[PDB]
Design a protein around this motif. Structure first.
Motif, mmCIF file in Angstrom:
data_model
loop_
_atom_site.group_PDB
_atom_site.id
_atom_site.type_symbol
_atom_site.label_atom_id
_atom_site.label_comp_id
_atom_site.label_asym_id
_atom_site.label_seq_id
_atom_site.Cartn_x
_atom_site.Cartn_y
_atom_site.Cartn_z
ATOM 1 N N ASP A 64 36.078 20.752 74.045
ATOM 2 C CA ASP A 64 35.861 20.922 72.544
ATOM 3 C C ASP A 64 35.188 19.703 72.061
ATOM 4 N N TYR A 65 35.565 18.428 72.377
ATOM 5 C CA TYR A 65 34.948 17.260 72.225
ATOM 6 C C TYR A 65 33.569 17.133 72.331
ATOM 7 N N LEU A 66 33.042 17.575 73.535
ATOM 8 C CA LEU A 66 31.771 17.532 73.685
ATOM 9 C C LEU A 66 30.868 18.499 72.956
ATOM 10 N N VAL A 67 31.285 19.953 73.014
ATOM 11 C CA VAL A 67 30.649 20.994 72.113
ATOM 12 C C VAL A 67 30.621 20.460 70.555
ATOM 13 N N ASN A 68 31.480 19.923 70.119
ATOM 14 C CA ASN A 68 31.547 19.461 68.568
ATOM 15 C C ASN A 68 30.502 18.222 68.540
ATOM 16 N N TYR A 116 33.648 29.631 73.225
ATOM 17 C CA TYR A 116 32.345 28.960 72.637
ATOM 18 C C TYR A 116 31.384 29.904 72.307
ATOM 19 N N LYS A 117 31.599 31.179 72.142
ATOM 20 C CA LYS A 117 30.667 32.468 72.104
ATOM 21 C C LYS A 117 29.394 31.981 70.881
ATOM 22 N N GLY A 118 28.486 32.234 71.260
ATOM 23 C CA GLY A 118 27.071 31.756 70.524
ATOM 24 C C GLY A 118 26.757 30.340 70.407
ATOM 25 N N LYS A 119 27.566 29.509 70.796
ATOM 26 C CA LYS A 119 27.340 28.109 70.711
ATOM 27 C C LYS A 119 26.644 27.292 71.886
ATOM 28 N N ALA A 157 30.095 37.530 82.641
ATOM 29 C CA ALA A 157 29.554 36.502 81.855
ATOM 30 C C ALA A 157 28.786 37.491 80.734
ATOM 31 N N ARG A 158 27.858 38.150 81.183
ATOM 32 C CA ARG A 158 26.992 38.845 80.285
ATOM 33 C C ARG A 158 27.743 39.442 79.139
ATOM 34 N N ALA A 159 28.615 40.158 79.619
ATOM 35 C CA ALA A 159 29.629 40.839 78.566
ATOM 36 C C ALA A 159 30.394 39.936 77.465
ATOM 37 N N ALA A 160 30.652 38.654 77.932
ATOM 38 C CA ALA A 160 31.372 37.689 77.182
ATOM 39 C C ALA A 160 30.522 37.179 76.062
ATOM 40 N N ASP A 161 29.212 36.855 76.305
ATOM 41 C CA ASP A 161 28.058 36.314 75.351
ATOM 42 C C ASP A 161 26.892 36.668 75.862
ATOM 43 N N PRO A 162 26.134 37.510 75.343
ATOM 44 C CA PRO A 162 24.903 37.930 75.740
ATOM 45 C C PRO A 162 24.119 37.195 75.172
ATOM 46 N N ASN A 163 24.255 35.958 74.421
ATOM 47 C CA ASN A 163 23.285 34.898 73.813
ATOM 48 C C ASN A 163 23.030 34.110 74.793
ATOM 49 N N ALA A 164 23.856 33.719 75.695
ATOM 50 C CA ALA A 164 23.625 32.647 76.539
ATOM 51 C C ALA A 164 22.758 32.990 77.764
ATOM 52 N N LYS A 165 21.980 32.113 78.173
ATOM 53 C CA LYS A 165 21.314 32.190 79.559
ATOM 54 C C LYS A 165 22.387 31.773 80.678
ATOM 55 N N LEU A 166 22.394 32.993 81.814
ATOM 56 C CA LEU A 166 23.210 32.927 82.817
ATOM 57 C C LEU A 166 22.520 32.168 84.155
#
Ligand SMILES: N#Cc1ccc2[nH]nnc2c1
Length: 299
Positions: A64-68, A116-119, A157-166
């Motif tokens: 969370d620290y890193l993402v924020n 962290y979906k979308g981030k 992973a694709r089902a959890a967040d389709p916005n991320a590159k896997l």
């Protein structure tokens, strides 16, 4: 000068760095990362050991620290590694039942990515899955699930967040004649032909001196597997000679699917290979000749 700004001007997505709270709160790391880099990866705080040290008992403060920090400073975020043999709690590697491990692996993947979906721009879903001869590395996932653990992990992973590159990532992919390099290309080709959502190959470029030259051939070979992206990850070079770093940068400029480069840290004494002084900033946090050479090459 900022190598991230300059590589963006050449049409790439980012120049990135691996970091975490321990570095962002000490030395000049925050200032350098703000000024010079456009993307950050947590070096340890997103690994399995840190995030799920007991099954279903997650620990997200460091990640969370890193993402924020990244969001507050306008940095792209990569994260991982969701499934590899490193940083793996013994409660995972001691599982012997196939259905049990599939469900544990899916829950680890889904919980991290949903939080962290979308981030997150890039998730390294599977790491260090190959032996040096190109066969699959025998970790608990291969031992217990079999080779299907890699398709399952990417599907989940694709089902959890389709916005991320896997991504799948591995090291010693630096020579086009080396068996491990052609093997991961052959495997990723088949996984993609079968619909597995592998968006990228990440080359973990922990390089010995002089290996930069071979990357000019190995990187386009990795790109021939036909993932939407390839990336340079964990980049450091023993001796940090400008020749090696300029070669690596030229390779990513030459490969249209190469979106960017991530160096393993900021300053030499914080490298796990500090005695080889392999990073772009010295122990006084000043840019080294290799940093200036990258700037000049990109201008
Ligand atoms: N640079 C980089 C980097 C470090 C740790 C990682 N874990 N998963 N992906 C990663 C990428």
């Amino acid at each position: 000068q900022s190598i991230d700004q300059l590589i963006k001007a050449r049409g790439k997505v980012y120049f990135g760095v691996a970091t975490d709270q321990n570095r962002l709160t000490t030395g000049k790391n925050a200032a350098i990362i703000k000024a010079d880099f456009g993307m950050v990866w947590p070096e340890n705080s997103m690994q399995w050991d840190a995030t799920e040290p007991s099954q279903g008992n997650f620990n997200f403060a460091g990640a969370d620290y890193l993402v924020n920090w990244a969001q507050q400073n306008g940095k792209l975020i990569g994260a991982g590694c969701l499934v590899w043999h490193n940083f793996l709690p013994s409660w995972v590697s001691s599982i012997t039942d196939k259905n049990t491990l599939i469900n544990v692996m899916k829950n680890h993947i889904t919980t991290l990515m949903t939080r962290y979906k979308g981030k997150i721009r890039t998730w390294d879903v599977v790491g260090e899955a190959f032996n040096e001869d190109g066969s699959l590395r025998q970790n608990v996932f291969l031992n217990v699930i079999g080779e299907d653990y890699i398709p399952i992990a990417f599907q989940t992973a694709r089902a959890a967040d389709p916005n991320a590159k896997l991504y799948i990532m591995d090291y010693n992919l630096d020579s086009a004649s080396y068996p491990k390099t052609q093997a991961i290309v052959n495997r990723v080709k088949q996984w993609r032909a079968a619909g597995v959502p592998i968006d990228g190959i990440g080359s973990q470029m922990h390089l010995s001196a002089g290996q930069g030259a071979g990357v000019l051939q190995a990187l386009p070979l990795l790109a021939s597997a036909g993932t939407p992206e390839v990336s340079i990850l964990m980049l450091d070079v023993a001796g940090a000679s400008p020749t090696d770093y300029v070669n690596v940068v030229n390779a990513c400029l030459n490969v249209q699917s190469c979106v960017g480069i991530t160096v393993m840290g900021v300053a030499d004494p914080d490298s796990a290979f500090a005695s080889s002084t392999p990073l772009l900033f010295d122990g006084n946090f000043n840019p080294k000749p290799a940093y200036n050479a990258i700037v000049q090459d990109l201008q």
